Every structure is written in structure tokens, then in C-alpha cells.
Amino acid sequence: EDKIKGMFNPKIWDKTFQDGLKKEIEDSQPYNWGTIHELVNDDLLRAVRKEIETEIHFTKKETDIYRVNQSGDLANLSGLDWDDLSRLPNLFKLRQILYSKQYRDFFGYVTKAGKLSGSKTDMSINTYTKGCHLLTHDDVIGSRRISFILYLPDPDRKWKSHYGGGLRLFPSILPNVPHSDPSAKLVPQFNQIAFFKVLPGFSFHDVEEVKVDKHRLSIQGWYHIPQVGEEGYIPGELEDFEFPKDERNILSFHEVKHFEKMLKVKLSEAEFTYLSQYISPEHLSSKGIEKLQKQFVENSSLQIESFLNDDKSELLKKVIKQKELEQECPYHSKDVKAPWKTAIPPHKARYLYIDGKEYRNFQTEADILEALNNNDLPNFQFTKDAIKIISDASGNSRENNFDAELALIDLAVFHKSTIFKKYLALLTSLCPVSEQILIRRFRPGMDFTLATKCRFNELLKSNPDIIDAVLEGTLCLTPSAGWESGELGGYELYMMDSVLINDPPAWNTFNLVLRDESVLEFVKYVSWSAKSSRWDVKMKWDVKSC
Ligand SMILES: O=C(O)c1ccnc(C(=O)O)c1
Ligand SMILES: [Mn+2]
């Protein structure tokens, strides 16, 4: 109990240091946080690092929100037992000093956090290697009160910014609506600690992907609200902001009656002619249709390869590749321009999309409230019109042309056609009654979605004819290679609340899934190492049985 203070940098016991740090935390941005360099006795932390590397077996784990080499999953033999640190005596001592009354008095003082539990120790040890990442979250769980991360990269080398693995903090547009882009990034060194009071609606942060073949070790922890009576402690002494909305617009009665009439291969020569403008002959034949029909009957899903015909395939591949190679992709939401929008908020998703609605760029609360007071509906031809006029002005250079947006919008218009929906009804024996179409681009090192269920149309819940499912299509147009292992991310994942579909990005594929209430779906974060964005067209429909 005497040697505890001496196991820290002596500056933290200095009144001048403490008061200075308290003020720095008070006045920090974008929410209250701070950092201390050279926190712990150097020999102790060096010994901890050596113990960890020697004694702990790390296991890669990937979910929608992270990829990390973990040690924490118990019931798996490699799982770290915090009740048995027999062989990690230095780690045992590190935990002891961090949760000591002496340190908690200091730390609670400078963070203005109030009392902190000494008995509720809560730490975990993780390494990040190339491709590892942890996407946006606020740490708000149970009795967590202060978050800290102590960093243990190689003590004899500087960790460089371009290595990645930075701790990024996100400012607040309004409570529970973090800005899509971070406003600060800490590049951590050995024996540096970062920390922040856990703040519902505000303490949003992530860990930037590690971009090089290095290992970075960290020890993440929390201080908790004390146990009742612990050291005297006495207890007590949003959908609206998501864009795009998971909402569909109902179809005209003309369309719905068309589909019913057909279901109660009744496609005309003229309709096949229209469908063959975009779709491969293989999938318009009597046999191809029969195969797809049976596959959907047996699986309630379809995974079609070479969906579009060669003409539209060649066109789209050219213009997408050209845009990838010769134009500057925006990498901040402020830089995104019509016809594109940024999906928000970043603790739910981040990607670029074209929805056909009037342009929005959400930098301020006022920008959001303006959109919510003035809801508008998609119109893809007007979006085309607007592009053409921006395009003519600048000139349509190799570096500014909208060739890819125009082709993609044309493709969206095809899927918006009454005849395509007739084809869809033919394949599925379902009658679409609503639609939402989005063109999406997932940039390397930025974009992703997280695991969510479909959103039923509330107004239609009482309708017996309408199936309790959402039909969802994905037309992938990703022309780059290297995705097959899933290691570059970008894979489309459908799973039950076991995996139904795990499809890395590929060129010219069409996935179709009839989702019941409990099916989860996401597109995994695209690695910085990916050779292009993931490009796709997303389609959703409410359906009734005929
Ligand atoms: O392990 C980390 O470095 C880390 C950083 C930020 N957040 C977490 C977390 O688990 O909340 C962990
Ligand atoms: Mn965290």
C-alpha cells in the first residue's frame, strides 16, 4: 500500500499537474476526454507487455462492428481468467494500482466523475493487426462510468500515424447524433492512456483500422459506479435522424393490378423485349425462369450470377472503373456533392448513396430539421436532369464527369419499371406493393452497415394479404479483385437471430431474399486495403400473396 504511488509517474500526485489536467479535460473537444503520457512505471509496464506476449493466446474475432484479436472469450480454453493471474504477476499489479484508492481519488478528481468502484475491476486485453478495427460506439453499457485505454505498442519504436490504429472521437450534431466524420484522432504510444467519462448520446469514438503489418497491444478498461455502500457510496446521492430512412413508397394501383392479374410465364413479347434491354438472356428463358422459380420456392431467396446482359455489364464496368481510377472520391461528408448523400449516423452506418431525393448534406442540426420538416420523394429522372446541367457547366472532363452516376441511375429506373416488377412477381409468385431503390457506394476505410432487421411498414401491419416479410434485392457491381476470402470486408451477410448468405463483393450478381422479422443483414466494413469501393443497387419491397 506504500509502494502504490511510486508505481506511477510522480507527476500525477502533484497538485499543479492535477489541477491543470482537470481544466484540460473540462475544456476538451468534442466531449470531455484526456490523455496522460508515461503513466506507469516504465519497468513495470515493460514487464506487463512481455508477460502478455508470452502468456496470453489471442484469437481473431470478427463481427459487424469489429475485427480484433481477443483474449476475453471464456468457455474457450484460450479465454483469459482474471481470477487466475498466477503467471501474470505484473498484470495483477497493474490492475491493483489502477483500481487503488489512491489512483481512483486522482482520476475521479480530474475527470469530475464522482466516486469510482475499486472492486468492480473491468479490463480486457486485445491486439490489433493489419485490417483490425472497431467501428463507432459510445461505450454506454451498465454501470460503466469512465473508459480508459492504456497502450502498449513496441516501447522502443514510435507508432506512426500512417500505421493506423488511431483512437477517433466524433463530435455531436445533436444528442445521440454524432457527426459522420471524426474531429480528433489520437496516435497512441507506449505507456500512454486515453480516457473519457462515458456519456450517453455523446461519447462516440472508434478505432481506426490498422493499415500495416504490425501488432498493437492495448488494455481497455472501465471504472464503474461503486457497489452500494462501497466506500460509503449511496445510489442517487432517434429513428428520425437516420438517413436514408428504412421506408418504402407504395406503388400505383395500375402496377399492383398488373401483378395480380398475372398471378391469377405470362410475359408478352414486348415485355421480354423491354427486360432484355438490361437482363441476361439466360435469366429470361423459359428454363431459366423455371429454375429461378423453383430455387425461390425452396429457399425463399435467389443468388443470381451474371444478372445483367453483356452490353449493360460492359457499360457499367467501364464507367465505374473509370471513376475509381481517375476521379477524387470524397472522404469527408462535407465534400460529398449531388447526387450523392452520406448515410448517418455513424454508430449505425456510413456509406454514399443516391436515392433520387433533393440534395442533403447534414453538417448541422438545422440541416437535419430542415429535411424532417420538408420530406420529399425520390425522382430519378429529375436527378438525371440536375446532373446533366451541373455536368455541362464544368465540362465533363475525365476528372469530373457523371458517367457512372448516369448509368447507375438508368439502371435504377429499369428496376423501378412496371415491367421489371412484373418479372420479379413472376420469379417469386409475390405481388410487390411498395418500393425503395438506392444506389450505394462503400469506400475503402470508411463505409459499412451494422446488423439490423427489416422494418415493417406500420400502416400495412393490419393487412392480411400483405406478407410479414420484406423482399430485398442487391445487385452488386464491384469490379475489383481480391475479395474472395472476406478479408477485405464488403461482404453481404444475412443471418438468423447461423448464416444464410455470406457473399463478398463480386461483379454483376443479384441476391434476393424474403426477410422475415428476425433475419439480420449487414455489409461488412470495407478495408482500407480494398482495391475499389463496393458498388451496388439496393431494392426493397413490401409484398402480398396472390
Ligand atoms: O481495445 C481498444 O483499444 C478499444 C478502444 C476503444 N474502445 C474499445 C471498447 O471495447 O469499447 C476498445
Ligand atoms: Mn470503446
Residue numbers in the entry: 23 to 259, 279 to 305, 328 to 560, 587 to 635
Q: Can you provide the manuscript's text about this entry?
A:
OGFOD1 catalyzes trans-3 prolyl hydroxylation at Pro62 of the small ribosomal subunit protein uS12 (RPS23) and is conserved from yeasts to humans. OGFOD1 in Homo sapiens, Sud1 in Drosophila melanogaster, and Tpa1p in Saccharomyces cerevisiae were found to catalyze prolyl 3-hydroxylation of the highly conserved Pro62 and Pro64 of uS12 (RPS23) in humans and yeast, respectively (Ban et al., 2014; Katz et al., 2014; Loenarz et al., 2014; Singleton et al., 2014). We describe crystal structures of the human uS12 prolyl 3-hydroxylase (OGFOD1) and its homolog from Saccharomyces cerevisiae (Tpa1p): OGFOD1 in complex with the broad-spectrum 2OG oxygenase inhibitors; N-oxalylglycine (NOG) and pyridine-2,4-dicarboxylate (2,4-PDCA) to 2.1 and 2.6 Å resolution, respectively; and Tpa1p in complex with NOG, 2,4-PDCA, and 1-chloro-4-hydroxyisoquinoline-3-carbonylglycine (a more selective prolyl hydroxylase inhibitor) to 2.8, 1.9, and 1.9 Å resolution, respectively. Prior to its assignment as a uS12 P3H, crystal structures of Tpa1p revealed that it contains tandem DSBH domains, only one of which, the N-terminal domain, was predicted to harbor the catalytic machinery (Kim et al., 2009; Henri et al., 2010).
We determined structures for OGFOD1 and Tpa1p in complex with the broad-spectrum 2OG oxygenase inhibitors N-oxalylglycine (NOG) and pyridine-2,4-dicarboxylate (2,4-PDCA) (Rose et al., 2011). Following optimization of hits from high-throughput crystallization trials, diffraction quality crystals for full-length H. sapiens OGFOD1 (542 amino acids [aa], 63 kDa) and S. cerevisiae Tpa1p (644 aa, 74 kDa) in complex with Mn(II) and inhibitors were obtained (catalytically inactive Mn(II) was used as an Fe(II) surrogate). Tpa1p crystals were monoclinic and contained one molecule in the ASU as for the reported Tpa1p structures (Kim et al., 2009; Henri et al., 2010). OGFOD1 and Tpa1p bind 2,4-PDCA slightly differently. In the Tpa1p:Mn(II):2,4-PDCA structure the 2,4-PDCA C-4 carboxylate is positioned to form a hydrogen bond to the side chain hydroxyl of Ser240, yet surprisingly is not positioned to form a salt bridge to the side chains of Arg238 or Tyr173 (corresponding to Arg230/Tyr169OGFOD1), respectively; in part this appears to be due to the unusual conformation of Arg238. These observations provide further evidence of flexibility within the 2OG binding pocket of the uS12 hydroxylases, a feature that might be exploited in selective inhibitor design. In all of the OGFOD1 and Tpa1p structures, the inhibitors ligate the metal in a bidentate manner. Previous structural studies on Tpa1p, which is reported to be a homodimer in solution, identified a large dimerization interface between the CTDs of two protomers (buried surface area ∼1900 Å2) (Kim et al., 2009; Henri et al., 2010).
